[PDB]
From Swiss-Prot:
GO terms for molecular function: ATP binding; metal ion binding; riboflavin kinase activity. Transmembrane segments: none annotated. Mg(2+) binds at residues 26, 28. GO terms for biological process: apoptotic process; flavin adenine dinucleotide biosynthetic process; FMN biosynthetic process; positive regulation of NAD(P)H oxidase activity; reactive oxygen species metabolic process; riboflavin biosynthetic process; riboflavin metabolic process. Catalyzes the phosphorylation of riboflavin (vitamin B2) to form flavin-mononucleotide (FMN), hence rate-limiting enzyme in the synthesis of FAD. Essential for TNF-induced reactive oxygen species (ROS) production. Through its interaction with both TNFRSF1A and CYBA, physically and functionally couples TNFRSF1A to NADPH oxidase. TNF-activation of RFK may enhance the incorporation of FAD in NADPH oxidase, a critical step for the assembly and activation of NADPH oxidase. It comes from Homo sapiens (Human). It is an enzyme of class 2 (transferase). Keywords: ATP-binding, Cytoplasm, Flavoprotein, FMN, Kinase, Magnesium, Metal-binding, Nucleotide-binding, Transferase, Zinc. This is Riboflavin kinase. Zinc or magnesium. It catalyses: riboflavin + ATP = FMN + ADP + H(+). The keyword tRNA-binding does not apply. Gene3D superfamilies: Riboflavin kinase-like. Coiled coil: none annotated.
Amino acid sequence: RHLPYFCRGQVVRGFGRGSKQLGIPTANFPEQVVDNLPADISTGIYYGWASVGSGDVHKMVVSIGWNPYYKNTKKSMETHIMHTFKEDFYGEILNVAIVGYLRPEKNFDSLESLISAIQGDIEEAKKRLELPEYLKIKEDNFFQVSK
Ligand SMILES: Cc1cc2nc3c(=O)[nH]c(=O)nc-3n(C[C@H](O)[C@H](O)[C@H](O)CO)c2cc1C
Ligand SMILES: Nc1ncnc2c1ncn2[C@@H]1O[C@H](COP(=O)(O)OP(=O)(O)O)[C@@H](O)[C@H]1O
Ligand SMILES: [Mg+2]
């Protein structure tokens, strides 16, 4: 319904152990950004395009989940960009276009299944983003203003 969804936010640290440990870093935004997501952007795994500051636009996946830790009933969002960065980018602005949905969140019985699933999401996202309908969003003025 509300795809593509465009948003921008400062990259901020998260809690627990960071998914850098898995070789799959996931960037967070301030809760203000997540809170302004339309209700119809259900939890689950999405894909799209991202850039950092005035950088180039790269493929990405986003996980939207429920936040256990805040009162009311808040969501969480984290983005893994399919690009090798040479340094962290905490405090920079991450620009995202969420363009498609992959699947609901799932319960996994092991880290082995979870990691395999995440890697599979990343591979499927790379393929879907080649479709001309999604490939063009890479060139949206949304991103062209950020350079
Ligand atoms: C693309 C992607 C898909 C994910 N899918 C799930 C999932 O289906 N179930 C889950 O419990 N966690 C999922 N996660 C959460 C992942 O376990 C999380 O990144 C770290 O555990 C904490 O940042 C996913 C993360 C990413 C980046
Ligand atoms: N490909 C990438 N995608 C997302 N973040 C990246 C990427 N490469 C480097 N990073 C850095 O990794 C950080 C996320 O690492 P992570 O271990 O998930 O910790 P946290 O969620 O606590 O910030 C981002 O804020 C960013 O600085
Ligand atoms: Mg993270």
